[PDB]
Subunit: 148 residues, 2 copies
């Protein structure tokens, strides 16, 4: 047997998703604290683009990137509390994503490097982690490799 | 047969990256000459990543593993220009420049920053008439392996 769920998505209509892809956000996301479950929808293998889609609110879907594909010097320090919270035990567990603010033209799109999405897919746990002590920019130009 | 409906226009297709999807018949694009090296693939659907972004896949409706990763090249190369010959205009029943969408095939590399785009041979789609082709441009200096990302420093000091 399998465990599949039909999910209404913002950009792709209804998709069938394995249940083990359903990520619990026990604390939701800041300003969306009641949104306790999301699914990661990648664009295409080998690309750094994704959407983080609410499994309960079709119109809530964050366009995100793997920032490490765009910004060579970007690093994320995970606090112990975040590690506990997401049941992380090892480096390979962890996926980092960053929210786009998509602009017209697309070349002006920015990336929030202060507040990454952190997902432990293995344990189906996620959160948005707000970095306080950093000099990262909440509006880093997506197409400027060098950090502001 | 003992159950009637008006849902015959919705087609179920297996996609490379999104699983099984339902697609409206009016999204099915006829490629009457197929695509070069895939001349038997006469029907594709355009699957956009997300509104406001230039990323799409061009998915065969007959062959699950044939899905081209493509971009709107104008989002990356503002000065890009595509000349449709008179015969292409007729082939795709274009009756207005607003009918036309241009896409360019990616060659996705690892790391992604090394990805190239084919600027010599765009995908040309008339969505209103559901007709497409790939057109190899003549008499241009466009690069078939144009870097998608700018890694050079251009000086006009
Ligand atoms: K909810
Ligand atoms: Ni089971």
């Amino acid at each position: 047997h399998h465990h599949m769920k039909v999910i209404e998505t913002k950009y792709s209509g209804k998709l069938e998703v394995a249940e083990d892809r359903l990520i619990a956000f026990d604390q939701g996301i800041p300003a969306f604290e009641d949104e306790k479950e999301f699914v990661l929808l990648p664009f295409a293998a080998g690309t750094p683009y994704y959407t983080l889609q609410s499994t309960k609110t079709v119109d809530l879907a964050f366009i995100i990137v793997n920032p490490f594909s765009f910004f060579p010097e970007y690093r994320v320090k995970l606090p112990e509390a975040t590690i506990a919270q997401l049941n992380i035990t090892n480096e390979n567990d962890v996926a980092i994503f960053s929210l786009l603010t998509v602009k017209e033209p697309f070349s002006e799109t920015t990336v929030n490097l202060q507040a990454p999405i952190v997902i432990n897919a293995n344990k189906q746990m996620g959160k948005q982690l707000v970095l306080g002590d950093t000099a990262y920019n909440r509006k880093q130009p997506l197409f400027q490799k060098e950090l502001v």
